[PDB]
Design a protein around this ligand. Structure first.
Ligand SMILES: NC(=O)C[C@H](NC(=O)c1c[nH]nc1-c1ccc(Cl)cc1F)c1ccc(F)c(Cl)c1
Length: 293
């Protein structure tokens, strides 16, 4: 990871970036701020191109749709906690998800949003904003403190609070047992495994496949080919001063990257040529751009 350059907030003594995503066509870097702004930076020039008032509290997380038309945001306090923005011609709010502190798009066909409110998952239609499903089974709850509900790659399944759901029947098919207080887990992009903190479970048989100690208290994101996994341990900054890369096929670590600055977020471009990391220089949180490669 070869550092290239830094994006900082123009017209501020201290930078206040909290999260990052590349635009679908990688023209711009979208940066959320601690004041609820979404700032667009030209990747080539480093220049701030727009600053949009999205929330009345710090933005925590962003997700652009693959087709470039939509953006999800989540914030910290107050209402709405999450929202869907149109990215075509005029930047505007399409819908709000008032109660949900985290939101993701569906994966295969991006026609749905999944939101999380504590132990509960909400699925919404993108066009209508209507709530299609509520997924919560009190007999299977793990009550994970940092629960984040997610679709699998085919959108047939959801993981919510370590419970596997069949979306089509809206029935719980399996509870993965609780071995940590915080992390609820994700689907591997390979479609075969679920990664819940340090445990790698077989999605089909539910048997334990691997123990991966380095993943304890980590959030993860994959490169776009699903060959490399990035993990950063939750701790103020959401993360510590390091992230680790892993071989996605065998969960063996590749590199340990200590930036010696607390991390707020990281993202890669669709081509995985670039890595952007929000790093505290101080709060003075800048976006450092790296060559991957
Ligand atoms: N943009 C992404 O998805 C990437 C992801 N970033 C977050 O999860 C992230 C950023 N701020 N806060 C959070 C956060 C923290 C806890 C939870 Cl429960 C849910 C969250 F969204 C991530 C993954 C691996 C990493 F190495 C790093 Cl540094 C970041």
């Amino acid at each position: 990871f070869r550092p290239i350059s830094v994006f900082r907030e123009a017209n501020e003594d201290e930078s206040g970036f909290t999260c990052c995503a590349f635009s679908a066509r990688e023209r711009f870097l979208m940066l959320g701020t601690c004041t609820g702004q979404l700032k667009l930076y030209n990747v080539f020039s480093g220049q701030e191109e727009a600053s949009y008032n999205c929330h009345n509290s710090a933005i925590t997380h962003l997700e652009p749709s693959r087709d470039g038309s939509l953006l999800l945001t989540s914030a910290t306090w107050s209402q709405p906690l999450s929202a869907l923005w149109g990215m075509k011609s005029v930047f505007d709010m399409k819908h709000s998800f008032t109660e949900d502190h985290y939101v993701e798009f569906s994966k295969h066909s991006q026609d749905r949003v999944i939101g999380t409110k504590g132990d509960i998952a909400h699925i919404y239609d993108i066009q209508t904003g209507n709530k299609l499903l509520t997924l919560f089974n009190p007999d299977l709850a793990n009550n994970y403190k940092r629960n984040c509900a997610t679709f699998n790659p085919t959108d047939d399944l959801v993981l919510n609070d370590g419970v596997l759901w069949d979306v089509r029947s809206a029935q719980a098919i399996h509870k993965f047992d609780k071995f940590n207080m915080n992390i609820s887990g994700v689907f591997h992009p390979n479609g075969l495994e679920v990664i819940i903190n340090t445990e790698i479970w077989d999605l089909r048989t539910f048997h334990l496949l691997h123990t991966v100690p380095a993943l304890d208290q980590c959030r993860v994101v994959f490169n776009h080919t699903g060959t490399v996994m990035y993990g950063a341990m939750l701790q103020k900054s959401p993360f510590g001063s390091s992230f680790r890369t892993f071989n996605a096929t065998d969960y063996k670590p590749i590199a340990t990257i200590d930036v010696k600055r607390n991390i707020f977020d990281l993202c890669t471009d669709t081509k995985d040529c670039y890595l952007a990391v929000i790093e505290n220089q101080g709060m003075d949180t800048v976006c450092r751009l790296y060559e991957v490669g």
